[PDB]
Amino acid sequence: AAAAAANLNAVRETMDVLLEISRILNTGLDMETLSICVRLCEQGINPEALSSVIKELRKATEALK
Amino acid sequence: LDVLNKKYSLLDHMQAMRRYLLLGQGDFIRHLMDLLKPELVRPATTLYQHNLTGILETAVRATNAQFDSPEILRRLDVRLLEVSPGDTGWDVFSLDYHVDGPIATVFTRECMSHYLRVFNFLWRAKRMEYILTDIRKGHMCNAKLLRNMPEFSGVLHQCHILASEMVHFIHQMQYYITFEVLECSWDELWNKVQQAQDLDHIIAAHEVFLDTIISRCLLDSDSRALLNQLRAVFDQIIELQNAQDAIYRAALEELQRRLQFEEKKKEEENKRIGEFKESIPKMCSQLRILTHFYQGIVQQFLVLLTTSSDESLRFLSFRLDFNEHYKARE
Amino acid sequence: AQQERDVRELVRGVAGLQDEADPNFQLALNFAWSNFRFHRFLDVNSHKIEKTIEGIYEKFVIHSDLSKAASWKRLTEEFLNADAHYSILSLLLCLSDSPSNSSYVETP
């Protein structure tokens, strides 16, 4: 609809807000990876779990270097 | 005013608020940083306050700070900030004077935040200074053994020069932190409390004392660029701390190895001599380009410093440019 | 379903792998499934998050980075308007922190 797309505007607004929040904490995350983990937490998941797996896979560019 | 300064001793709080919290005493502080060397150089993710308090007790009992009242001494204790996975002890550390009296009305939390900021600024610079003094001691100790290694004499001399450039800058800045920064402000506060006829006048004298020490130090939102320039000067100290021992940890070892070859003999050292003729020039040029880089940035600091604030910041330029060696470089 | 695709996308994206016949992909995916299906984590409390956020704001203030503190406070308070908020925030907090540089050019 029309009101159903202003919501898509509004989640884009919040995710650019979260994108700045990501950039000033100096995370390795960008908007696209952030776009995956929000979906994961919409399904429900420990952020303790996801931080652990990201801290593992970021060491997998170091296991092949 | 009479009952406040006798029953609760309001003035002793100020006297211990400069000496300790604003690092106004330094017999205490040098021994404190000495005991806190191996602990704070270790990364602070595994740092917990109970290891700080116990060594703090030994440090305060040993030094001059012991002689004041146990009440204000008891109101001094450490505190830490939040941790990071990049954290090291010199980055995250605090002294926190906790108030147990009604004196909070004259020592409000905003000015406690001011105390915290000036303390952090005066903590980093006192760490890097001791690093520099360590470098100078390493120069004064190692070099009388490297008289029997002739080929390093070039680069080893050249390091000697660059140290003298830092030793100057770190001994003049730390004199500007000595006078006018902790001394005009203290005179203002010390006059306007010891005369005072109103509690409001005490408070408003405290206010301007904090404002002046914020302005005279580089803690404004406008002197931030100067502060960034200063942080770049703090960087090259630990760079030199690396490189100076990066000389010795290969150099001085070879002489003991050579004595071991001699004790064997009672061709390989020819190779050891040959490797020096390759090793020396690139390390020399590394030192050269570092020297160029540092001398480049410090001149840019000074030329900005000339017109930033009219009188106060201008006084730094006369002390820091005594010989007029700067502007004779550009 | 979409969760499994998310795990695929996450592993592919941050590891930079382009193949799922990659055995290392298989090991990392098995790692993720063992990670998800074992719960030994602590549950998140919102007030502890708020304490963490104000502590970060304090540490910004102490380092004379006042404008970054004001923006960080404003942005976080703005984000918490209009539970999942807290989980995303806790994630973002815990993931990395070494901040000593500005790492910012935007105040639009």
Swiss-Prot record, chain A:
Localization annotation: Cytoplasm, Cytoskeleton, Microtubule organizing center, Centrosome; Cytoplasm, Cytoskeleton, Spindle
An annotated GO cellular component: interphase microtubule organizing center
Keyword Secreted on entry: no
Keywords tagged on the record: Acetylation, Cytoplasm, Cytoskeleton
Superkingdom of the source species: Eukaryota
GO biological process: gamma-tubulin complex localization; microtubule nucleation by interphase microtubule organizing center; mitotic spindle assembly
Main localization category: cytoplasm
Keyword Cytoplasm: yes
Role summary: Required for the recruitment and the assembly of the gamma-tubulin ring complex (gTuRC) at the centrosome. The gTuRC regulates the minus-end nucleation of alpha-beta tubulin heterodimers that grow into microtubule protafilaments, a critical step in centrosome duplication and spindle formation.
Oligomer and partners: Associates with the gamma-tubulin ring complex (gTuRC) consisting of TUBGCP2, TUBGCP3, TUBGCP4, TUBGCP5 and TUBGCP6 and gamma-tubulin TUBG1 or TUBG2; within the complex, interacts with TUBGCP3 and TUBGCP6 to form a luminal bridge with actin that stabilizes the initial structure during complex assembly. Interacts with TUBG1.
Similarity comment text for this entry: Belongs to the MOZART1 family.
Descriptive protein name: Mitotic-spindle organizing protein 1
Organism: Homo sapiens (Human)
Gene from which this protein is expressed: MZT1
From Swiss-Prot, chain B:
Alphabetical GO biological process terms: cytoplasmic microtubule organization; meiotic cell cycle; microtubule nucleation; mitotic cell cycle; single fertilization; spindle assembly
Tissue/organ expression: Ubiquitously expressed.
GO cellular component: centriole; centrosome; cytoplasm; cytosol; gamma-tubulin complex; membrane; polar microtubule; spindle
MF terms in GO: gamma-tubulin binding; structural constituent of cytoskeleton; structural molecule activity
Subcellular location: Cytoplasm, Cytoskeleton, Microtubule organizing center, Centrosome
Transmembrane domains' residue ranges: none
Top-level taxon of the source organism: Eukaryota
Keywords: Acetylation, Cytoplasm, Cytoskeleton, Microtubule, Phosphoprotein
UniProt function note: Component of the gamma-tubulin ring complex (gTuRC) which mediates microtubule nucleation. The gTuRC regulates the minus-end nucleation of alpha-beta tubulin heterodimers that grow into microtubule protafilaments, a critical step in centrosome duplication and spindle formation.
Record's subunit section: Component of the gamma-tubulin ring complex (gTuRC) consisting of TUBGCP2, TUBGCP3, TUBGCP4, TUBGCP5 and TUBGCP6 and gamma-tubulin TUBG1 or TUBG2. TUBGCP2, TUBGCP3, TUBGCP4, TUBGCP5 and TUBGCP6 assemble in a 5:5:2:1:1 stoichiometry; each is associated with a gamma-tubulin, thereby arranging 14 gamma-tubulins in a helical manner. Gamma-tubulin at the first position is blocked by TUBGCP3 at the last position, allowing 13 protafilaments to grow into a microtubule.
Family: Belongs to the TUBGCP family.
UniProt name for this protein: Gamma-tubulin complex component 3
Species the sequence originates in: Homo sapiens (Human)
Top-level taxonomy: Eukaryota, Metazoa, Chordata, Craniata, Vertebrata
Part of the intact protein present: 546 to 890 of 907
Curated annotation (Swiss-Prot), chain C:
Source organism, top-level taxon: Eukaryota
Full protein name: Gamma-tubulin complex component 5
Subcellular location field: Cytoplasm, Cytoskeleton, Microtubule organizing center, Centrosome
Role noted for this protein: Component of the gamma-tubulin ring complex (gTuRC) which mediates microtubule nucleation. The gTuRC regulates the minus-end nucleation of alpha-beta tubulin heterodimers that grow into microtubule protafilaments, a critical step in centrosome duplication and spindle formation.
Tissues with expression: Widely expressed, with highest levels in heart and skeletal muscle and moderate levels in brain.
Gene this chain is encoded by: TUBGCP5
Residue numbers of the full-length protein present here: 13 to 130 of 1024
Species annotation: Homo sapiens
Family according to the record: Belongs to the TUBGCP family.
Subunit note: Component of the gamma-tubulin ring complex (gTuRC) consisting of TUBGCP2, TUBGCP3, TUBGCP4, TUBGCP5 and TUBGCP6 and gamma-tubulin TUBG1 or TUBG2. TUBGCP2, TUBGCP3, TUBGCP4, TUBGCP5 and TUBGCP6 assemble in a 5:5:2:1:1 stoichiometry; each is associated with a gamma-tubulin, thereby arranging 14 gamma-tubulins in a helical manner. Gamma-tubulin at the first position is blocked by TUBGCP3 at the last position, allowing 13 protafilaments to grow into a microtubule.
